[PDB]
Design a protein around this ligand. Structure first.
Ligand SMILES: CCCCCCCCCCCCCC(=O)OC[C@H](COP(=O)(O)OCC(O)COP(=O)(O)OC[C@@H](COC(=O)CCCCCCCCCCCCC)OC(=O)CCCCCCCCCCCCC)OC(=O)CCCCCCCCCCCCC
Ligand SMILES: CCCCCCCCCCCCCC(=O)OC[C@H](COP(=O)(O)OCC(O)COP(=O)(O)OC[C@@H](COC(=O)CCCCCCCCCCCCC)OC(=O)CCCCCCCCCCCCC)OC(=O)CCCCCCCCCCCCC
Ligand code: BCL
Ligand SMILES: CC[C@H]1c2cc3[nH]c4c(c3C)C(=O)[C@H](C(=O)OC)c4c3nc(cc4[nH]c(cc(n2)[C@@H]1C)c(C(C)=O)c4C)[C@@H](C)[C@@H]3CCC(=O)OC/C=C(\C)CCC[C@H](C)CCC[C@H](C)CCCC(C)C
Ligand SMILES: *[C@H]1O[C@H](CO)[C@@H](O[C@@H]2O[C@@H](C)[C@H](O)[C@@H](O)[C@H]2O)[C@H](O)[C@@H]1O[C@H]1O[C@H](C(=O)O)[C@@H](O[C@H]2O[C@H](CO)[C@@H](O)[C@H](O)[C@H]2NC(C)=O)[C@H](OC(C)=O)[C@H]1OC(C)=O
Ligand SMILES: COC(C)(C)C/C=C/C(C)=C/C=C/C(C=O)=C/C=C/C(C)=C/C=C/C=C(C)/C=C/C=C(\C)CC/C=C(C)/C=C/C=C(\C)C(=O)O
Ligand SMILES: COC(C)(C)C/C=C/C(C)=C/C=C/C(C=O)=C/C=C/C(C)=C/C=C/C=C(C)/C=C/C=C(\C)CC/C=C(C)/C=C/C=C(\C)C(=O)O
Ligand SMILES: COC(C)(C)C/C=C/C(C)=C/C=C/C(C=O)=C/C=C/C(C)=C/C=C/C=C(C)/C=C/C=C(\C)CC/C=C(C)/C=C/C=C(\C)C(=O)O
Ligand SMILES: COC(C)(C)C/C=C/C(C)=C/C=C/C(C)=C/C=C/C(C)=C/C=C\C=C(C)\C=C\C=C(C)\C=C\C=C(C)\C=C\CC(C)(C)OC
Ligand SMILES: CCCCCCCCCCCCO[C@@H]1O[C@H](CO)[C@@H](O[C@H]2O[C@H](CO)[C@@H](O)[C@H](O)[C@H]2O)[C@H](O)[C@H]1O
Ligand SMILES: CCCCCCCCCCCCO[C@@H]1O[C@H](CO)[C@@H](O[C@H]2O[C@H](CO)[C@@H](O)[C@H](O)[C@H]2O)[C@H](O)[C@H]1O
Ligand SMILES: CCCCCCCCCCCCO[C@@H]1O[C@H](CO)[C@@H](O[C@H]2O[C@H](CO)[C@@H](O)[C@H](O)[C@H]2O)[C@H](O)[C@H]1O
Ligand SMILES: [Fe+3]
Lengths: 59, 71, 336, 48, 39, 273, 62, 101, 60, 60, 60, 60, 39, 39, 60, 39
């Protein structure tokens, strides 16, 4: 489900579409509602990709 | 029938007509170019017996993928 | 209780309504003037005749067909049900092509109508620009308005050029009320939080500054409208006490002032720079920078917070995922 | 996927918007609106 | 405005140009049809 | 220094508080009692911001971050190094902004102007007061305020939005956005029109209100007129800030779910349920 | 191969140089009325020095 | 549309300009106010006609005469109300001691 | 019945009529082209015996 | 009593009243229609013993 | 009773009346069309015993 | 009865009528086209006994 | 506006036009009911 | 605007124009019917 | 035929024509350059027998 | 505006310009066809 690049510049490693980010966003709304929580329960939304900035519940 | 040009200014009708005809022409070419059977830029060299038929299904291709590789 | 100039109790009407003064060729005024009592209570009353010319007529034909293609695809997507067309309207979309097509022509149902609607809309917008430019010249006015409108068109065109530069029409904005907001949010997700794009931050500063200025300037002119301050062209050519008092208010408040003319230059640039810095920020996204937060870490924008979690080395290998791939095109049985 | 198999037409969504399953369909459960989500069955006439 | 004489003159060209255009389009369809028939 | 026409305007009177005591200028600036209180709060607040930077991890301008307290402190003052400083700076901010609006009222009264500018600024103060006073009070802890830091407050905006899963679906936010965008369009048209009649192409005579009116009427189909466009610009710019205040105060205190599921009422209208 | 310098940064300083140029231009335009300033030490111009006062050609008759 | 003088309150049925033959204190108050205004409005309209006749500008004389005639017609409408309220005031016991007109 | 043209200006009626017919023709062609049975650009060469019908396969 | 029709315009009060009753009646019907007990378009043929009743007090 | 047409302009009343009846008629038809029991375009050929009924009390 | 045309300008009424009938007719056709039973573009060649019917009695 | 004679004349067309249209709609429903009855 | 004998002349063209259009459309339908009937 | 230049100012038509031809040419080049068969900047040196061809009917 | 002989002079260049453009386009199309035919 990952779509975010782990570097500053664009690269062959990630060619995700904005449509694929829409699909992950759909999936994540489903998970949030399934628990009765919002995105900040598992993310710091300044970086959805980040694990260090996110609570342990993301693991 | 020529009295239609008294009722409408031909200088205005000619602009509306050229507009209508250009949009219609462009619509039909873009419609055909998006079809399987008539996408002549890619498949125009095919004979009439081997151009696609019946490709009317709405999801002929996958909706979700990465972009094509950067090379 | 003191009269606030927000509403006009007494309108006057002229039996004739003013016409267009000059240059009637290659195009003509449609209709004739009429008065609106409500519009005449907000502001001036004449709902006018209107000008098109060649560029205006063609702009409407192209733009009508674009809107017609958008609406008919929306209505087809609820199976032509006219109740669902209204009930579901803000969720309906005409959607870009699939990503694996890149820049190739896609199938008609799978984004081929999208590109066609986008083409006619773009031509329609350019013809409407030509209309505005020609009309400014015919009224013997400066071209300040068409260059202001060109700045908006610049931002609009980046929603074509950035998808072109990243190499896929799938990255374009869907035509739809909530869908284009879904795209807007997902674009910031994909490219790693657009708040750290510095041209996005600049565009916001100019968007806010445009609200600051029109609030300040709108309030300033109403505060001196008791002295004819709203007759701004007269105040520019023949400075009255209304212009002097509005200059002194801002000088005494914040230590510097504009003039009755040059305040309109501040206004013009703050509006224009909103969409111009915005467009640059889009064109850099996915082409030069792919994760704006990491660009912000590199350049020192990102405030440090204490860690909320720490990964062990084997979790750093376990918790990496996969980049998202293709949807499954089969329905597996698990019988064996 | 190495190649694409097209789904049966009754499994193909009419709405191409990516998020509509979360933003609408998880709260909307009107029967007629539900039925419209997928293309209906479609068969060559000589196979009826 | 136009005179009726002027309108009649314009109508002659307009009808002729319209029918000429339709004839050219009729040939373009004859070529298209013989390349790849649509029925 | 004074503008060439200014001196005859520099009379006494028009103050709300203090009378002649502070009724004087300093360079271009009018002082007044609320000028004195402005400088006090500005200075105290700014130096406490510098103190916040000093005890934080960096002097990098973009990264300075004076954060509110933990939610556990509720409506009390927290320890100063744990967010109590943000609370003291917030009081200075409220004092500085209020003093600025009242000083604007004194200036306008001295010039015989209407009170439009102070009240228009009140729209912005309302939004700030909503963000740091009213919404945190309704939620029961000052820690719901945003942090003072050029980019850390954007992290707060991001996270508050995603507390409601998809903040674009907030209906008051859609209105607020529409006002902000419509304001910027209207400002570009008003600026362009005045400049284009006052700065026509070389050798053309100066334009007129009639030409401006004619052109505008070809743009929108109707004449707004001179006072009408300034009413519109004020309505749009201040309405944008008022609807912003509404959109954030309903998020949390009144609506707690995701914003997309608020639209369920529209789907269930009886004509099409 | 420059690691720190990148196109987004280059663009941003390009903009800053334009923007500070633009503020100067606008502050020159803002001084076409009311300047030079009166002072007990004689006239003052501020900075930048203002553009000169415009004279406006009226519509010849109508 | 709302009438000019009761405005917003006409939505709630307060409408004191309407032709009233019974005695009513509210209509009497309104009629005394509107008579004084309309007498002054006629006085203004005939001053305006005299001024424009002195200037001799025929199309302006024509309109000023038309305006004066209209102003007289409106005054007559209020004087009719004043008299019919006067008739009622004499007989309805609670009514004013001062005449309406 | 020609006195309808005294009641309505033919110059407006013909613009309305032509405008209406063009939009109606466009709508109907788009509805048909969206259908399975009459998507004629892909399936126009099929005989009527093998063109799609909106029914499921028999024997359920 | 009747002198109230001197104090208020009959023509005007009747419109205000008739508009008020229209609004009140429609509101009450729509409140009932969205209940369970009185969703009469779906369940109107149920007998009074058979129609829904809101959940009762009994609890652990 | 015809005096009511002296109190009100009958052409204003007829416009207000006809518009009210039109909207009301449409609202009722769309309410019914959205119901299960009266979805007559899909199920109008069902007999009165076959037609849907809304859920009853449990009475368990 | 004809004096109704002295109350209203027939030029305005007859336009309003044509507008109403045109939109109403379109609505009805599209309400049918989107149903199962009357989806005549896909299924119009089905016989009346073959045409769909909505679901009926609720239980086995 | 109209005279009483013009209203009288127009009304004859309007009533006949309406009932004519209703007759055509009656045959359309007859055809539709024969093809696929809705009750 | 229109004269009586101006309106009557115009009406003649409108009738033959309408009929000519309806004829072409009728051929268009019966051709489409022969290709792929909808009932 | 020349009288078309009396009806239309050629200093307008020339500019409109040049603009139309410019945008048309740019569109057609852009359509071709985006295609597989005619992406001549990358594949122009391929011989005609080597250039891409789009699919076929899968006629066994 | 142009006179009729001023227009008829302009028309000669316009036709020649159009023919020249079409000729160049024809040679271009024939080069393109010989390089990579589209039918
Ligand atoms: C984010 C995107 C959108 C961001 C949008 C931001 C928009 C900001 C626009 C406004 C900025 C200019 C404000 C202004 O003009 O104030 C008047 C003052 C003096 O000139 P004067 O008014 O014509 O003449 C009066 C003076 O000569 C004599 O007056 P008096 O004798 O009565 O009083 C004493 C003197 C002492 O002088 C000073 O104190 C001046 C100190 C100015 C410091 C602030 C500069 C800010 C520059 C921001 C632009 C940028 C700088 C990099 O005069 C005064 O007391 C005047 C007091 C004026 C107080 C103005 C305070 C403005 C603070 C604005 C802070 C903005 C922060 C963003 O002007 C100046 O001193 C020079 C300003 C020159 C324009 C800025 C151009 C910068 C270009 C880049 C550097 C160029 C280097 C050569
Ligand atoms: C990269 C993204 C691009 C993406 C593509 C984006 C393209 C955007 C282009 C926007 C251009 C706007 C320019 C403009 O508005 O000028 C004002 C003028 C209206 O004013 P006017 O006063 O009514 O004009 C008539 C006349 O009175 C003007 O006289 P003036 O004295 O002012 O001079 C203006 C002329 C100068 O004259 C000429 O250039 C004509 C000379 C003809 C010589 C013929 C050769 C004979 C001698 C042989 C030796 C000759 C030796 C030389 O110039 C202009 O200002 C207009 C210049 C042409 C504009 C072309 C626009 C297309 C540009 C494409 C660029 C593609 C990219 C490179 O209007 C126009 O020029 C109209 C522009 C053309 C619009 C055509 C409609 C588009 C339809 C598209 C349909 C496409 C699907 C079929
Ligand atoms: C989760 C969402 C993301 C986000 C994602 C984006 C994206 C993505 C974009 C922006 C952009 C903008 N964002 Mg941001 N944005 C977020 C948060 C914010 C916040 C905030 C308080 O949090 C604010 C104030 C802003 C503010 C802004 C603006 C400054 C800027 C748009 C300028 C403009 O005028 O656009 C409005 C003006 C236009 C769109 C121009 C249109 C002109 C054309 C010509 C009009 C055509 C009309 C046509 C004729 C008719 C149409 C008919 C119909 C088709 C039927 N964003 C977060 C971080 N933002 C844009 C930008 O510039 O980014 C750098 C942009 O593309
Ligand atoms: C400086 C930046 C801001 C800005 C500026 C700006 N926008 C502008 C302008 C300016 C200065 C204009 O001059 C221009 C304008 O016209 O303003 C009124 C415009 C404009 N800004 C617009 C919108 C807009 N601006 C936006 C934003 C902004 N604009 C920025 C905030 C947004 C946002 C925030 O999303 C939008 C949506 C448009 C209203 C207008 C450009 C209009 C235009 O190009 O229209 C083209 C035509 C059509 C789409 C077709 C309409 C068809 C109709 C359905 C009628 C059909 C009739 C008939 C059937 C066909 C014809 C038949 C013939 C025979 C006659
Ligand atoms: C049906 O097929 C699709 C397409 O393969 C499967 O989806 C794949 O897996 C998803 C992770 C991904 O989203 C999608 O892009 C695609 O890669 C889908 O899950 C179903 O899978 C079953 O059928 C597969 C099939 O393609 O036949 C089959 O795959 C295996 O067999 C084929 C044919 O012999 C061979 O080409 C594949 O390489 C092989 N794949 C693997 C991974 O072994 C699946 O079998 C297995 C073990 O995966 C089927 O899956 C199941 C559980 O039955
Ligand atoms: C969810 O539910 C859903 C599914 C939606 C279902 C529910 C549907 C509902 C609620 C339907 C309601 C339908 C309805 C009412 O409400 C329907 C009412 C319809 C009516 C009244 C139709 C009237 C038609 C009249 C016509 C066509 C007139 C033609 C006139 C002609 C031709 C002559 C013109 C004049 C001439 C020529 C003379 C000029 C002479 C002159 C000038 C002279 O001589 O001078
Ligand atoms: C998916 O399917 C869905 C959509 C769901 C299904 C539903 C569909 C629905 C509801 C359809 C409704 C259709 C409809 C309803 O009425 C359709 C009505 C159609 C009509 C009336 C067409 C009329 C056409 C008339 C024409 C073309 C006339 C041409 C005239 C010409 C050329 C001559 C012009 C005049 C001249 C030359 C004289 C000048 C002389 C002068 C000036 C002189 O003499 O002075
Ligand atoms: C989606 O579909 C896709 C994929 C896009 C496919 C479909 C594409 C389609 C539908 C294409 C349509 C193409 C088309 C349709 O018409 C194309 C029509 C093209 C035309 C008409 C071209 C005409 C060119 C004419 C030119 C260049 C003239 C030049 C003239 C010159 C140089 C002389 C100027 C005058 C002089 C010097 C004299 C001055 C004297 C004076 C002043 C004096 O003497 O006074
Ligand atoms: C019967 O008539 C009906 C009832 C259908 C009429 C009603 C219609 C209705 C209801 C329409 C509703 C429309 C709505 C709600 C539209 C919403 C639109 C929104 C909100 C759009 C927002 C953003 C869209 C953007 C930014 C799109 C940008 C697209 C661009 C720039 C596309 C450019 C494409 C180009 C230049 C294509 C070129 C063609 C190729 C590439 C092939 O060749 C050069
Ligand atoms: C001519 C533009 C259209 C070309 C279309 C393709 C070629 C087909 C037409 C071949 C014949 C040339 O076209 C023919 O030109 C003559 C004049 O020369 C036009 O004649 C028209 O104008 C002349 C005056 O110039 C009038 O007297 C006449 O009543 C009128 O019809 C005809 O209406 C047209 O039919
Ligand atoms: C898909 C298309 C989307 C288009 C969206 C269009 C949305 C348009 C919504 C318009 C809503 C107007 O709503 C109106 O807003 C103004 C904003 O000033 C409110 O007004 C409010 O602010 C003003 C200042 O401006 C105060 O003086 C006033 O006391 C206060 O009530 C009005 O009380 C409210 O009635
Ligand atoms: C497709 C739907 C619409 C179809 C409408 C047509 C329906 C077919 C029947 C038409 C029958 C016409 O029958 C009759 O015609 C005459 C023609 O003068 C009309 O007569 C009307 O005009 C004449 C002459 O202008 C007047 O003198 C007369 O007083 C007036 O009634 C009648 O009012 C109408 O009843
Ligand atoms: Fe202004």
């Amino acid at each position: 489900a990952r779509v975010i690049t782990q570097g500053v510049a664009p690269s062959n490693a990630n060619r995700s579409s904005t449509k694929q980010a829409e699909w992950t966003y759909a999936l994540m709304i489903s998970q949030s509602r399934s628990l009765g929580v919002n995105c900040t329960y598992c993310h710091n939304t300044r970086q959805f990709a980040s694990w260090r900035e996110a609570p342990p519940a993301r693991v | 029938m020529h009295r239609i040009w008294l009722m409408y200014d031909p200088r205005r009708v000619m602009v509306a007509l050229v507009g209508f005809l250009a949009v219609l022409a462009l619509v039909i070419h873009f419609v055909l170019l998006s079809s399987q059977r008539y996408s002549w830029i890619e498949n125009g060299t095919l004979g009439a017996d081997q151009a696609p038929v019946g490709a009317s299904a709405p999801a002929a291709a996958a909706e979700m993928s990465p972009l094509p590789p950067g090379r | 209780l003191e009269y606030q100039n927000l509403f006009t109790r007494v309108q006057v009407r002229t039996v004739p309504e003013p016409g267009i003064p000059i240059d009637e060729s290659t195009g003509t005024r449609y209709g004739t003037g009429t008065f609106s009592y409500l519009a005449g209570k907000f502001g001036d009353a004449q709902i006018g005749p209107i000008y098109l010319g060649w560029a205006g007529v063609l702009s409407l034909i192209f733009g009508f067909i674009a809107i017609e293609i958008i609406g008919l695809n929306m209505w087809a997507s609820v199976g032509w049900d006219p109740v669902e067309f209204i009930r579901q309207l803000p969720w309906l979309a005409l959607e870009p092509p699939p990503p694996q097509y890149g820049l190739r022509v896609p199938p008609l149902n799978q984004g081929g109508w999208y590109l066609m609607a986008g083409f006619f809309l773009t031509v329609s917008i350019i013809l409407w620009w030509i209309r505005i430019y020609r009309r400014a010249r015919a009224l013997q006015m400066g071209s300040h308005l068409p260059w202001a409108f060109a700045s908006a068109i610049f931002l609009y065109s980046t929603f074509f050029f950035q998808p072109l530069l990243v190499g896929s029409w799938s990255e374009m904005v869907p035509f739809g009320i909530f869908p284009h907001l879904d795209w807007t949010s997902a674009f910031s997700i994909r490219y790693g939080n657009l708040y750290y794009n510095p041209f996005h931050a600049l565009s916001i500063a100019f968007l806010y500054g445009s609200a600051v200025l029109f609030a300040m300037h709108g309030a300033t002119i109403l505060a001196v409208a008791r002295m004819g301050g709203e007759r701004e062209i007269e105040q520019i050519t023949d400075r009255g006490t209304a212009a002097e008092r509005s200059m002194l208010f801002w000088r005494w408040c914040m230590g510097f002032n504009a003039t009755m003319e040059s305040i309109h230059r501040w206004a013009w640039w703050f509006a224009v720079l909103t969409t111009f810095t915005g467009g640059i920020g889009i064109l850099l996204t996915g082409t030069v920078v792919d994760n704006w937060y990491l660009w912000g870490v590199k350049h020192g924008l990102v405030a440090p917070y204490p860690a909320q979690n720490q990964l062990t080395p084997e979790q750093q290998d376990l918790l990496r995922g996969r980049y998202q791939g293709t949807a499954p095109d089969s329905f597996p049985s698990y019988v064996v | 996927g190495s190649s694409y198999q097209q789904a049966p037409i009754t499994n193909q969504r009419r709405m191409r918007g990516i998020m509509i399953q979360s933003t609408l369909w998880d709260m909307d459960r009107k029967r007629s609106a539900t039925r419209q989500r997928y293309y209906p069955a479609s068969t060559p006439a000589n196979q009826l | 405005g136009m005179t009726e004489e002027e309108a009649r003159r314009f109508h002659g060209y307009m009808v002729t140009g319209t029918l000429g255009y339709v004839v050219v389009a009729s040939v373009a369809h004859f070529l298209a049809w013989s390349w790849r028939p649509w029925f | 220094a004074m503008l060439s026409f200014e001196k005859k305007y520099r009379v006494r009177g028009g103050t709300l508080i203090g009378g002649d005591l502070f009724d004087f200028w300093f360079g271009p600036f009018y002082v007044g009692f609320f000028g004195v209180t402005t400088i006090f709060f500005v200075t105290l607040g700014t130096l406490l911001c510098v103190w916040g930077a000093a005890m934080g991890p960096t002097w990098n301008l973009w990264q300075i971050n004076i954060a509110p307290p933990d939610l556990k402190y509720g409506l009390g003052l927290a320890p100063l190094r744990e967010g109590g400083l943000w609370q003291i700076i917030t009081l200075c901010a409220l004092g500085a902004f209020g003093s600025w609006a009242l000083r604007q009222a004194e200036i306008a009264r001295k010039l015989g102007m209407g009170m439009h500018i102070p009240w228009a600024y009140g729209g912005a103060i309302l939004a700030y007061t909503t963000l740091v006073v009213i919404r945190p009070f309704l939620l029961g802890a000052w820690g719901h305020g945003f942090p003072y830091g050029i980019f850390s407050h954007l992290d707060w905006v991001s996270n508050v939005g995603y507390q409601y899963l998809h903040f674009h679906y907030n209906p008051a936010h859609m209105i607020a956005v529409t006002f902000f965008f419509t304001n910027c369009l209207a400002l570009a048209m008003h600026g362009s029109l005045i400049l284009s009649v006052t700065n026509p192409p070389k050798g053309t005579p100066t334009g007129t209100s009639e030409q401006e009116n004619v052109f505008f009427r070809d743009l929108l189909g109707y004449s707004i007129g001179a006072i009408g466009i300034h009413r519109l610009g004020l309505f749009l710019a201040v309405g944008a800030a008022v609807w912003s205040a509404i959109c954030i105060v309903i998020s949390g205190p009144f609506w707690t779910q995701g914003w997309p599921e608020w639209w369920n009422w529209w789907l269930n209208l009886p004509i099409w349920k | 191969m420059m690691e720190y310098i990148d196109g987004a940064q280059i663009a941003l300083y390009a903009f800053w140089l334009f923007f500070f140029g633009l503020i100067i231009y606008l502050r020159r335009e803002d001084k076409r009325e009311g300047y030079p300033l009166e002072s007990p030490q004689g006239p003052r111009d501020g900075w930048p020095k203002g553009a000169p006062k415009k004279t406006y050609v009226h519509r010849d008759h109508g | 549309s709302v009438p000019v003088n009761d405005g917003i309150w006409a939505w709630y049925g307060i409408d004191d300009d309407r032709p009233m033959a019974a005695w009513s204190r509210f209509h009497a108050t309104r009629c005394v106010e509107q008579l004084a205004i309309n007498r002054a409005r006629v006085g203004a309209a005939e001053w305006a006609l005299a001024d424009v006749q002195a200037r001799g500008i025929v199309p302006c004389i024509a309109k000023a005469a038309a305006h004066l005639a209209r102003a007289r017609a409106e005054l007559a409408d209020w004087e009719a109300q004043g008299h019919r309220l006067e008739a009622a005031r004499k007989v309805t016991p609670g009514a004013w001691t001062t005449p309406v007109i």
